[PDB]
């Protein structure tokens, strides 16, 4: 069994989502098409949203999973505001490295640009700490 270990840091370049606004920017991270799902806080009306939140994640499969990682604007209704999202293969991440690294999010429909977005990403054995070479 193994375990991926995501902090996301931060994005920047995002697009103007709120006529009179800027962005409320959250992000949601997706193993696959497993049901469970997790999501940053919203960083209300900024282009540079900071969370460096993280999250554990167990992993099916080092090679065949992927992470989808959405982000979104809030908006002020019932529903948000789908900006981008981007499809992370997991074989990409040598076991046990801590990779650092942006990520350019490709835009949804009526979208301009899709923003990028750093996320520090480490595949595990479990119980290993997370975040530290292995
Ligand atoms: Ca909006
Ligand atoms: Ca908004």
Same mark, same amino acid.
């Given at each position: 069994?193994?375990? +991926?270990?995501?902090?996301? =840091?931060?994005?920047?370049?995002? &697009?103007?989502? !709120?006529?009179?606004?800027?962005?409320?920017?959250?992000?949601?991270?997706?193993?696959? #098409?497993?049901?469970?799902?997790?999501?940053?806080?919203? *960083?209300?009306?900024?282009?540079?949203?900071?969370?460096?939140?993280?999250?554990?994640?167990? +992993?099916? !499969?080092?090679?065949?999973?992927? %992470?989808?990682?959405? +982000?979104?604007?809030? !908006? $002020?209704? #019932? #529903?948000?505001? &789908? *900006? #981008?999202? *981007? $499809?992370?293969?997991?074989?990409?991440?040598? %076991?046990?490295?801590?990779? !650092?690294?942006?990520?350019?999010? @490709?835009? =949804?429909?009526?979208?301009? $640009?899709?923003?990028? @977005?750093? %996320?520090?990403?480490? @595949?595990? &054995? +479990?119980?290993?700490?997370?975040?530290?070479?292995?």
């Amino acid at each position: 069994m193994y375990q +991926l270990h995501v902090r996301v =840091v931060e994005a920047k370049e995002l &697009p103007k989502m !709120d006529t009179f606004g800027k962005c409320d920017a959250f992000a949601i991270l997706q193993l696959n #098409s497993s049901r469970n799902i997790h999501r940053t806080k919203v *960083i209300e009306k900024t282009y540079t949203p900071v969370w460096n939140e993280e999250f554990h994640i167990p +992993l099916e !499969d080092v090679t065949i999973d992927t %992470l989808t990682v959405f +982000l979104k604007d809030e !908006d $002020k209704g #019932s #529903s948000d505001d &789908p *900006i #981008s999202l *981007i $499809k992370i293969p997991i074989n990409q991440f040598p %076991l046990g490295e801590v990779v !650092d690294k942006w990520y350019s999010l @490709i835009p =949804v429909k009526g979208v301009k $640009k899709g923003g990028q @977005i750093r %996320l520090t990403i480490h @595949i595990a &054995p +479990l119980g290993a700490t997370p975040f530290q070479k292995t």
